Amino acid sequence: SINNVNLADGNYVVNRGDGWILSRQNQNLGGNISNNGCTAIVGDLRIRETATPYYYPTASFNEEYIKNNVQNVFANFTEASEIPIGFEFSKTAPSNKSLYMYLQYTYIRYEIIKVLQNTVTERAVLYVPSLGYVKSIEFNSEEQIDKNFYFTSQDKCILNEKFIYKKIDD
Amino acid sequence: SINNVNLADGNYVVNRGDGWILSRQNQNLGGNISNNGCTAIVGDLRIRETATPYYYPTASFNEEYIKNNVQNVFANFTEASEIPIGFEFSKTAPSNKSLYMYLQYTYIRYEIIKVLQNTVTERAVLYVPSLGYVKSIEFNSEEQIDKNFYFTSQDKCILNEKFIYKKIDD
Amino acid sequence: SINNVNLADGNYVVNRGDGWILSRQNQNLGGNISNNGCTAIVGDLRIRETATPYYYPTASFNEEYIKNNVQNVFANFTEASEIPIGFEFSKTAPSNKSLYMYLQYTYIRYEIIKVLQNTVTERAVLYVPSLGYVKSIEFNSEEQIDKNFYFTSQDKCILNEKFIYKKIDD
Amino acid sequence: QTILPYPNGLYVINKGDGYMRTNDKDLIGTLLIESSTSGSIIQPRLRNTTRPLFNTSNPTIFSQEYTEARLNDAFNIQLFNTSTTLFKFVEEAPTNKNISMKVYNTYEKYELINYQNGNIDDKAEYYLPSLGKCEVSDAPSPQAPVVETPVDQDGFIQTGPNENIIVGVINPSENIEEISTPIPDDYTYNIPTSIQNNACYVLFKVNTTGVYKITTKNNLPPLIIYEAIGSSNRNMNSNNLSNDNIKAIKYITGLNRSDAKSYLIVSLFKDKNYYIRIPQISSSTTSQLIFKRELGNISDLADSTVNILDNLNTSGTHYYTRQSPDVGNYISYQLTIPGDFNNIASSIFSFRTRNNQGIGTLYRLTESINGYNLITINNYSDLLNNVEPISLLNGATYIFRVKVTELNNYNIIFDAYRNS
Amino acid sequence: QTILPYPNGLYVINKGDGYMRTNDKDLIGTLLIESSTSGSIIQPRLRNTTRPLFNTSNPTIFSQEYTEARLNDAFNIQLFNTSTTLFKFVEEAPTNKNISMKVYNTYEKYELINYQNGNIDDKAEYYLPSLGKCEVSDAPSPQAPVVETPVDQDGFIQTGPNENIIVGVINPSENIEEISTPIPDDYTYNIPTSIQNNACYVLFKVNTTGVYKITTKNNLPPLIIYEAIGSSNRNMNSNNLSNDNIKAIKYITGLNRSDAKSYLIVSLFKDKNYYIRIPQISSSTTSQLIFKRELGNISDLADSTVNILDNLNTSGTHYYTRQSPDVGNYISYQLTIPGDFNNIASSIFSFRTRNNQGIGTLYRLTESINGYNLITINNYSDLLNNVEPISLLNGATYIFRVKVTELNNYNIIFDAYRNS
Amino acid sequence: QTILPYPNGLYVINKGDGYMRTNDKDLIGTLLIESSTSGSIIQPRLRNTTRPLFNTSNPTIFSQEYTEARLNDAFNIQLFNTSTTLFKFVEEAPTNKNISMKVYNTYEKYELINYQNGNIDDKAEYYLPSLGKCEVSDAPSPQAPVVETPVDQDGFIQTGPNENIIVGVINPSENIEEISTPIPDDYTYNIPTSIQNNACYVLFKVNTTGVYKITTKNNLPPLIIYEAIGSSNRNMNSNNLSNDNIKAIKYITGLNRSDAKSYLIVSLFKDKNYYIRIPQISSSTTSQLIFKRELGNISDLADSTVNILDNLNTSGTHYYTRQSPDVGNYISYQLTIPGDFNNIASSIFSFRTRNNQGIGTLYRLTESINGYNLITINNYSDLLNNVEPISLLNGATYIFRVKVTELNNYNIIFDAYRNS
Ligand SMILES: CC(=O)N[C@@H]1[C@@H](O)[C@H](O[C@@H]2O[C@H](CO)[C@H](O)[C@H](O[C@]3(C(=O)O)C[C@H](O)[C@@H](NC(C)=O)[C@H]([C@H](O)[C@H](O)CO)O3)[C@H]2O)[C@@H](CO)O[C@H]1O
Ligand SMILES: CC(=O)N[C@@H]1[C@@H](O)[C@H](O[C@@H]2O[C@H](CO)[C@H](O)[C@H](O[C@]3(C(=O)O)C[C@H](O)[C@@H](NC(C)=O)[C@H]([C@H](O)[C@H](O)CO)O3)[C@H]2O)[C@@H](CO)O[C@H]1O
Ligand SMILES: CC(=O)N[C@@H]1[C@@H](O)[C@H](O[C@@H]2O[C@H](CO)[C@H](O)[C@H](O[C@]3(C(=O)O)C[C@H](O)[C@@H](NC(C)=O)[C@H]([C@H](O)[C@H](O)CO)O3)[C@H]2O)[C@@H](CO)O[C@H]1O
């Protein structure tokens, strides 16, 4: 399953990759509607004030342990957070149809795992605010939409998941 | 004429429509010049500080009466005014010619009318700052220009005029 | 040479033209890298705070003498400096190649010359911050680059040099 | 106005995007874009303020702050009246004509309801500020004749694509209990005395993925089970249940009806967290919660409330009113035929339903030292009109599974008609 | 240096956009845009400050603040030294060459003048900060030989399209009187004693659209009438004149010359507001303003000053110097032939003009209980060279209408040459 | 790890742009751009703060502030930890696929080194914040199998184009002397007593462009000359040297070796400023700096250190180790043949080099009342393997010029082999 790793016994810090979207937060930022060849644009600014990290600590790994161990091997998100970064998406609505696009934040998934016998015994999780992602759909008041378009029930990555590790010491 | 309405006797609040430009204010914001295939862009921000309403009260209808009655049926421009909104226009100058475009604010015309015998007896007028409109013209130091291009002597609507009413009570 | 002018004896203020880049400051602002058809954009804001003038006074012509005499005939850069102005450049990287562009400030070269016998005896120089200029180059980790692309050893003008004068009085 | 196949409690319904008020009350502006020109309207967030719209049927309890709290439990919305999210529209007019560009502010409509026994007793509507709507069309003629038109009725119209996403939230007035250790194959939980004062939820996770039978030692009161949405694949501890205070719950199966003697059979995955809602036990005798992993095709009932049928030793109709599962879902009934057991002794039965239509499956429940086992006796492609009788061995136990195919009413009526 | 066919007073002239100073004093910067690259220069208004340029011939009266006040009366300009209006230029260079992009700040030139008897006695120039100018061209060669060039003369050059829009403003030093009630078919206004100290304006509106005769009871002093620009279709009250304090005025017709005995015939629309400027009446005898709606083809004189000719009972030339109307506009003359009336008795006349050219129309004024009536006696396609005589019935009254076709001089000279 | 053909001192090396840390430590973010959609990542400088990276081998002396000061002397960089320069990337995805857009922060790597006798004794690396890097590619599959991959080693990788620009700076611990007046054809400078305590630089300019011989009156110590980069065509005064405090210096020619008895022959332009570095003269006897403009083909040695060879009156090898010029540059040797002068009397010689390869030119130095004059005796296209002997007139003086064609070692060894 998801706990079978081919690593010696110990504690590791893993970069699960950029591109993670969180469960059911799909439409928290709102959606945009346009039509007849109009171009629609949505963007943001992950200013430290807004974009805040999501911690999921365990007994062996508390918030601090997770942070320091992540910012030590990978991008120091605490420093980076002081410098505003923007991103936008644009799409042109079809000639005689309506377009709907909604935006949501993406994240980098970091994990702190306790390995024992090539199996994960404990797992802490951190989601560091990254940028954003938009989903579009053409429509009319007549179309029924697959509700999975609007809702994500389990955290997932819109890119390819990763597993870049480094055994923790001390 | 302009005072013949097919409405029962009473006081009404009317939405004359968006797209109104005011008399002789044509070039108050200035104009832009470009040439040889260059793209020219002009825009603004109707920040409450600038974009201010134009009231034309009568005896039966004072400023307050006009405002409250308008913001009650139609868009509450007093609240909206706290949130900055921008708009821009762009146009590409011709290959070997000069382009001139000037900008001016557009408005929504609201009216408070006193009807009696299918005729307007009294009429109050409100112009709520909307967005903007630009006029272009190609030229050279040799061309004479129709002066109506630069000057509007009577308030008018660049879109189709409207007449959306609601009888006032009390 | 560069000191032979066809002017009567006296002191003149000369506009050597816009478009001057300074010696070895080529990459002070940094460079930008992109690839595979991506569009790259770099810009700035010569806000008074940053963009500061470069004075090269002589005995006969001190800083003040240079400024007042320049702002008297040509653009008053001291006033203009209070109003922020921006500029940008964009370029699309080639389909399967890398693009590198770096930005540097441009200037207007002003001179205060002492003429005697159709020859410059003394010369003061002022560089007023103008806008900016970008240089691009396509590349790969294999290409060797002409180092003159990265370094300018002697002040020069990227446009055509000028010589617009006016004899100073008093 | 349709049926809501859910248990009593609180639900937050995302009713869609693109909502705006009538009479252009949300019109930002209109641009007249002349031919060979481009126009643009922008919400640059030079100010992060936004103005949410709120409407409630009970200001005391369902206050705006309360509703916002629910919305947070359901979708985890952080910002309600601020935004740093920009939206802009750009349109170029053709060379032949003029274009009209209208832009409106919009809202996502979130509905908060207190759902009780197929009824909504409380309700609030929260309009979350959205990212606008832009309408472009051929510019109207400045000469177009003006038509006196009366203002529309005050209200909202939906502009975005059809959407109706239901999310249940933990009832904030009912406490949460927690079984710290991942439950093994067998487990008994003693229901705290607090249960005498109000219902509670019991948060837990199973150590081993599989099917489970869950119930109170007397099959009363009925239990309801939920999944903690998004709980899977986050923090984990083999020897301990990591909490995420996830208040968003997905109804699996269960009922509220008082006399629904029953037990649950559901498929549970170890990487997820679940909630069992135990109703208020108004008694001084300690109740229990028994968990048991089941091996075998008892899993055929996977995610279903097995209702034990009583008062069978009579003739004729035997109705059982229960909250109907949603189309596609199950609801089961267990029958121990009146009389003693000797193969030959039988009784004639005719299974039927009355409100909702569905597909039936009759199983013969059997025992083994390897757990249970179901033997398919027959299948029914029409329960609402079934007349086919079946003879069942007296003293034997059968389980009838119903898959709802048509949700006409809140309750599904099961009729175990006895012919002899 | 051309003729200004307007009455004495203040005028604000929009002389066009694109004005900038010489020697690149308004150059923002130049971008060298290499091939296959795009360049852009922006005025983002990160600071709203702008720097207007001012120039006056009389700092005491025509101060900058005063001039700004006039500009406000004329075009209603609100902001003089601030702007939130952005302007940006974008240019892509071709694949084959390099482009040079120059951007300059610009100004709209507003001219304020005190116009007195065909002469400008005071003048100020206000340069309103505009939205720039951008020049793109093939990038010059870095090797292009440098040419010693002397700086140009200090000053302004016009870069925008040709424009010259004249707008008159109420003289701020002359008070405004107001006839509150819409004037009916007949109305007499008593000129307040303040008229002894300086000219005044009388603001009013007619209850019924039509042609009107307006004058002082002795056809002296001459009157001038204006239209309040933009006054139509705003606030209105059938029983009252709604004011808009509109100080922008459009000259209809009227004269300043002291001895121009006359009355006005103009077309007035009820939805508009008008201003009649009454000159300073240096006398202790109360003057009056008589209004009378006219029915009939007297409207042929629509918008015209009807000058009553005196000292006709002589022979030869009879010159009358008056301020010339603009090309396309009218100016009339009324003649009551010397002698008593008996059809047969006549006198020979030759109508002619001297400074400006025009088209003449001779009318025979007649009376009826249904108002007046004009009978066309003859038309003239050349007044500056007319020699054709005409015999007019003595004791009868004729009106000669002149339509200016050529404005060569400030004054138009009318000659009612008497042959007998 | 290659040879650095430069004299002792400080150098700032721009090692290129596009530097970033491993393990995505500089990753700003990734956008998944769906087909027919455009994505963009922006550094808008809403905050001007930037974070430079620093690394030194000697924190005491080569502190960050010190290194920054050097970088300022070399490239005149003003802002080290702030920027108002924006960078943005835009990419549209095709209609057929999805694009992945990754953006990273980057740095320009500036290397500060204390170079002593072909060795780096101190070193610091300053990573100046740059304008980013953007990688676009086909979006990876969300299903792509995850591969356990160990983190890379902590460090930097170069992403930009190859670059290595060396710039020398005035050693800040060695004082600067200045010859105020443009030196005429002949000039002698008395070296201040400060020279006893440490080396100094003498800033000057020549009044007339041409070739010059520069040296100490005993051809000891050796001198080094530099050009003040960017000093040409700025402020100027015919009667005075205008200073620009330019600390960026371009090595022309010269050596550090203690016993390199010599003088310099270089081409100097009046519009430029130069620096002569005089080593520390540990003596109480005042030294001098003699300047002399040379007319004639002595200019053939243009920009070269002429090393005077000693101890020639022996047989066999005569090695002379000197710091090697860079490929393409010169280094000369002067020979006065042992013995008295009478045309016929000669000695056989074989010129050769040992570490680096080059092209040799043998000149016969002659005197005239019109200056010097060189007569080419022979040329050598291979010095590292030359065996061809040459007979030189005893008591005569010859100059051998070497043009380096191959830089294999820090030092170039010259061998004036005597055959007889
Ligand atoms: C004011 C008040 O307390 N309300 C009562 C109300 O409870 C009562 O309703 C009946 O309540 C009994 C439980 O005591 C049953 O629930 C009855 O419903 C049925 C059903 O539809 O399921 C009737 C059915 O006939 C029964 N089936 C059999 C085989 O007997 C089932 C069955 O007992 C249960 O489902 C348990 O398995 O119950 C329900 O009508 C009404 C009486 O109508 O009176 C109110 O005052
Ligand atoms: C210092 C001073 O006061 N100025 C006088 C100046 O007024 C005067 O000019 C003459 O003034 C009389 C009015 O009193 C007329 O306006 C004269 O002009 C004419 C005209 O051109 O219109 C002359 C013409 O011959 C007259 N026509 C006839 C038929 O008589 C008309 C006519 O009277 C009026 O138009 C009224 O209908 O007036 C004008 O020259 C001069 C004398 O030249 O002296 C100054 O000192
Ligand atoms: C601890 C200490 O003081 N160091 C000495 C070290 O100086 C010395 O090295 C020798 O030093 C002499 C100078 O006194 C020369 O520089 C020697 O180098 C050569 C050279 O390679 O150029 C040797 C060569 O044979 C010489 N050529 C001739 C024709 O004699 C030249 C020549 O004298 C100079 O170039 C001047 O023109 O010098 C160098 O080896 C060593 C002894 O090996 O001892 C250390 O302790």
What's the CATH code of the domain at D270?
2.60.120.1080
- Angstrom CA distances, F63 to D128, F112, F124, stand at 54, 11, 8
Reduce the secondary structure of F87-117 to three states and give it as a string: EEEEEECCCCCCEEEEEECCEEEEEEEEECC
Whether the CB-CB separation of B15 and D146 falls below 8 Å is answered with: no
Give the C-alpha separation, D103 to B131, whole Å: 11
**Residue F371 pairs with which residues in a beta bridge?**
F368, F369
With beta carbons less than 8 A apart as the criterion, state whether B75 and D26 touch.
yes
Nearest alpha carbon to residue E139 among E91, E87, E89: E91
Kindly report the number of other CB atoms within 10 A of residue A143's CB atom: 11
Residues D352, D403, single domain; the answer is yes
* DSSP conformational letter for F196: G
- For residue E373, the cross-strand partners are E366
Q: Quick one: tokens of D60? A: 């005391």
A65 close to D (CB below 8 A): no
Amino acid letter, A99: L
CB-count exposure of residue C117 (10 Å: 0-12, 13-18, 19+): exposed
Residues D86, D8 share a domain? yes
**d(C-alpha D333, C-alpha D318), whole Å:** 12
Give counts: helices (H), strands (E), chain E.
1, 32
Report residue B3 as tokens: 């005072």
- Bridge-partner residues for E188, per DSSP? E290
Q: Do chains B and D touch (3 or more CB pairs under 8 A)?
A: yes
**Cβ contact F347:F337 at 8 Å:** yes
Q: Among F207, F201, F198, F175, which Cα is nearest to F189's?
A: F201
Do E331 and E400 touch, CB atoms closer than 8 A?
A: no
What value, to the nearest 5°, has the Cα angle with vertex E318 and ends E316 and E323?
155
The 3-state DSSP class for residue C131 equals strand
D156 burial class (0-12, 13-18, 19+ CB within 10 angstroms)?
A: middle
Closest ligand by atom to E335 CA:
2
Check: CB of residue E186 under 8 Å from CB of residue E213: no
CA-derived radius of gyration, chain C? 19
> Do F377 and F364 meet the contact criterion of CB atoms below 8 Å apart?
yes
Work out the angle at residue D111's Cα, subtended by the Cα atoms of residues D106 and D115, and round it to the nearest 5 degrees: 170
Residue B47: φ, ψ to 5°:
-50, 130
- Cβ-based neighbours of E418, under 8 Å, separated by 6 or more: E312, E314, E315, E316, E318, E347, E348, E349, E350
- And the tokens for F41? 């990542």
Q: Contact, B42 vs D38, CB < 8 A? A: no
Q: List C-alpha distances in Å: F13 to D326, F108, F114, F165.
A: 73, 10, 11, 5
Find the ligand nearest to E333 CA. 2
Kindly state the DSSP code that residue B59 receives in the 8-state scheme: S
Enumerate neighbours of A (3 or more CB pairs within 8 A): D, F
Q: How far is CA F12 from CA F8, F68, F130, F166, in A?
A: 13, 10, 17, 6
Whether E253 and E116 map to the same domain: the answer is no
CB C95 within 8 A of CB C37: yes
Distance from C-alpha of B46 to C-alpha of D197, rounded to nearest angstrom: 58
Contact between B13 and B123 (Cβ < 8 Å): no
Token pair recorded at residue D33 = 């874009």
Question: Distance between CA E351 and CA E384 in Å, rounded?
Answer: 9
Q: What single-letter amino acid sits at E165?
A: I
In this structure, what DSSP letter does residue D62 have? S
- F249 and F315 housed in the same domain: no
In degrees and rounded to multiples of 5, residue E239 shows phi and psi of -100, 10
Listed residues D266, D293, D310: the one ending a domain: D310
**Widest pairwise Cα distance in chain E:** 94
- Cα–Cα distance list, F117 to C31, E407, F70, F227 (Å): 34, 93, 20, 21
Beta strands in D260-328 (DSSP E): 262-268, 274-278, 288-294, 304-308, 319-323
- CA of F28 relative to ligand 2 center, distance in Å: 88
Contact in structure between A21 and A156 (CB atoms under 8 Å): yes
Q: Which of B131, B136, B166 sits opposite D30 (nearest CB)?
A: B131
Beta strand D224-228 pairing with D248-254: antiparallel
Tokens at D354, concatenated? 């009355």
The per-residue b/e assignment along E314-353, b for 16 or more CB within 10 angstroms, e otherwise, is eeeebebbbbbbeeebbbbbbbbbebeeeeeebbebebbb
Residue to mutate (ligand 3; options F321, F322, F334; most atoms within 8 A of CB): F321
Tokens representing A148 are 């999975």
Task: State the fold for domain A1-170.
Answer: Proaerolysin; Chain A, domain 3 (2.170.15)
Helix (H) or strand (E) holding B99, with range, is: strand B98-115
Q: Which of C122, C132, C112 is nearest to C25 (CA)?
A: C132
Considering only CA atoms, which of A111, A131, A130 is closest in space to residue A121?
A: A111
Distance of CA D366 to the CA centre of its chain: 33
Query: SS3 for D53?
Result: strand
Distance, in Å, from the CA atom of C133 to the CA atom of E39, rounded to the nearest integer, reads 9
> Distance of alpha carbon F22 from its chain centroid, rounded?
32
Query: D256-289 burial string, b = 16+ CB within 10 Å, else e?
Result: bbeebbbbbbbebebbbbbbbbbbebeeeeebeb
Chains that touch D (3 or more CB pairs under 8 A): A, B
d(CA E307, CA E411): 14
Q: D150 in a domain, yes or no? A: no
User: Please, which residues bridge with residue D68 across strands?
Assistant: none
Residue ranges per structural domain of chain B: 1-170
How far does chain E reach from its first CA to its final CA, in angstroms? 42
F286 φ/ψ angles, rounded to the nearest 5 degrees: -55, 125
Report d(CA A109, CA D370) in Å as an integer.
Answer: 43
Q: Please tell me whether residues D44 and D54 are part of one structural domain.
A: yes
Reading the block at residue D175, the tokens are 């406490």
For residue D259, the CA-to-ligand 1 centroid distance in Å is 8
**Residue D192 and residue D277 share a domain:** yes
Closest CA to B115 of B23, B10, B21: B10
Cα(E111)–Cα(C44) distance, integer angstroms? 37
Question: Which residues, other chains included, contact F367 with Cβ-Cβ below 8 Å and sequence gap of 6+?
Answer: F373
Count of CB atoms situated within 10 Å of the CB of A67: 19
How far apart, in whole angstroms, are the C-alpha atoms of residue E89 and residue A144?
45
Here the CATH number for the domain that contains residue E341 is 2.60.120.1090
HEC per residue, F125-144: EEEEECCCEEEEEECCCCCC
Distance in angstroms (rounded) separating the CA atoms of residues E192 and E185: 22
Task: Round to whole Å and give the CA distance between D77 and D47.
Answer: 20
Cβ–Cβ < 8 Å for A15, F147: no
How does strand F149-150 pair with strand A164-167?
parallel
Residue type, E158: Q
Mutate to test the pocket of ligand 1, among D256, D320, D322, D333 (most ligand atoms within 8 A of CB): D320
Chain-centroid distance of CA C114 in Å reads 23
Number of domains forming the structure of chain D:
3
Same domain, E301 and E409: no
Q: What DSSP line would sit under E23-43, residue for residue?
A: TTTTEEEEEEE-TT-EEEEEE
Among residues E280, E310, E340, which one ends one of the domains? E310
Q: For residue F43, is it within any domain? A: yes
Burial class (CB in 10 A: 0-12, 13-18, 19+), E386: middle
On whether residue F55 sits in a domain, the answer given is yes
Q: Which residues contact F339 (CB under 8 A, 6 or more apart)?
A: F313, F345, F347, F394, F395
Q: What does the block give as tokens for E137?
A: 């061209």
Outline where C9-127 has alpha helix (H).
63-73, 77-80
CB atoms within 10 A of CB D381: 10
Token output for A31 = 């959606």
- How many Å is the Cα radius of gyration of chain B? 19
Gap between the Cα atoms of F275 and D23, Å rounded: 80
3-state secondary structure of D356: coil
Ligand closest to CA E320: 2
Among residues E105, E140, E175, the one where a domain terminates is: E140
Report how far residue E87's alpha carbon sits from residue B163's, in angstroms, rounded to the nearest whole number. 35
Tokens 């062996």 sit on residue: A60
Instruction: Point out the ligand 2 atom lying closest to the alpha carbon of residue E307.
Output: 37
Name the percent of chain B in helix, strand, coil, to the closest 5: 10, 45, 45
Kindly state the DSSP code that residue A17 receives in the 8-state scheme.
-
Q: Which residues pair with D107 in a beta bridge?
A: D19, D129
Residues E304 and E174 in one domain: yes
Angstroms from F255 CA to nearest CA on chain C: 24
Instruction: Give this entry's resolution in angstroms.
Output: 2.7
User: Cα(E394) to centroid of ligand 2, in Å?
Assistant: 26
Does any domain span residue E275?
yes
In a shared domain, residues D299 and D320: no
Q: How far is the CA of F411 from the centre of ligand 3 (A)?
A: 13
Whether C50 contacts chain F with CB within 8 A: yes
Contact E222, E260 (CB under 8 A): yes
Q: Which run of H or of E encompasses A64?
A: helix A63-73
Distance CA D162, CA D18 (A): 10
Nearest to A83 by CA among E247, F47, C23: F47
Q: Is E360 exposed, middle or buried (0-12, 13-18, 19+ CB in 10 A)?
A: buried
Residue E202 carries which side chain, given as an amino acid letter? V
F153 domain residue, yes or no: no
Using CA coordinates, name the residue in chain D closest to B85: D43
D335, D362 contact by CB (below 8 A): no
Q: What is the DSSP letter of C72?
A: H
Give me Rg for the CA atoms of chain F.
28
Residue D128: closest CA among D99, D104, D155, D108: D108
Are residues C108 and C133 in contact, defined by beta-carbon separation less than 8 angstroms?
no
Residue E117 lies in a domain: yes
The type of residue at D216 is T
Task: Give the whole-angstrom CA distance, residue F118 versus residue E27.
Answer: 52
Cβ atoms of F133 and F18 within 8 Å: the answer is: yes
Q: Are the C-beta atoms of F404 and F410 separated by less than 8 Å?
A: no
- On whether any CB of chain E is under 8 Å from the CB of B47, the answer is yes
CA dihedral in degrees (D137, D142, D144, D147; nearest 10)? 100
Q: Alpha-carbon distance A157 to E398, whole Å?
A: 96
What residue's CA is closest to ligand 2, atom 10?
E259
Method of structure determination:
X-ray
DSSP for E327-375? TT-EEEEEEE-SS---TT-EEEEEEEESSSEEEEEEEEEEEEBTEEEEE
Instruction: Copy the structure tokens of residue F12.
Output: 């700032």
CA angle at F327 for the pair F325 and F332, rounded to the nearest 5° = 40
Answer for the pair E130, B30: CB distance below 8 angstroms, yes or no.
yes
State which H helix or E strand residue A8 sits in.
none
**Ligand 1 centre distance from Cα of residue E298 (Å):** 99
Q: Of B14, B20, B32, which to mutate for an interface test with E (greatest number of E Cβ within 10 Å)?
A: B32
Containing domain of residue E299, as a range?
A: 159-310
Test mutation, C1, C16, C29, C44, chain F, max F CBs within 10 A:
C29
B113: which 2 tokens?
Answer: 């009318």
Indicate if D38 and D73 belong to the same structural domain: yes
Q: Are E156 and E109 in contact (CB under 8 A)?
A: yes
The reply to whether D146 falls in a domain is no
E259 C-alpha to center of ligand 2: Å?
8
Residue whose tokens read 């909604």: A102
Write out the residues of chain D at the interface with chain B, using a CB-CB cutoff of 8 A: 23-34, 36-44, 46-47, 49-51, 100, 139-144, 146-151
F358 and F222, same structural domain? Answer: no
Beta strand pairing call for D149-150 and B164-167: parallel
Instruction: To the nearest 10°, report the CA torsion of F4, F5, F11, F15.
Output: -50
Relative to the CA of E261, which ligand 2 atom is closest? 37
Examine the domain organization and report whether F169 and F301 are in the same domain. Answer: yes
Q: What residues have CB less than 8 Å from F172, skipping those under 6 apart?
A: F10, F69, F70, F73, F247
Using the Cβ of A91 and the Cβ atoms of chain F, whether some distance falls under 8 Å is answered with yes
Where does F312-355 have alpha helices with state H?
Answer: none
End-to-end CA distance of chain F: 42
Inter-residue contact F362 to F400 (CB < 8 Å)? yes
Is position E71 within any domain?
Answer: yes
Q: Which residues contact B142 (CB under 8 A, 6 or more apart)?
A: none
Report CB contact under 8 Å: C27, F75: yes
Place of tokens 């009916």: E184
Two tokens at C105?
A: 């400030």
Q: What is the CA radius of gyration of chain A?
A: 19
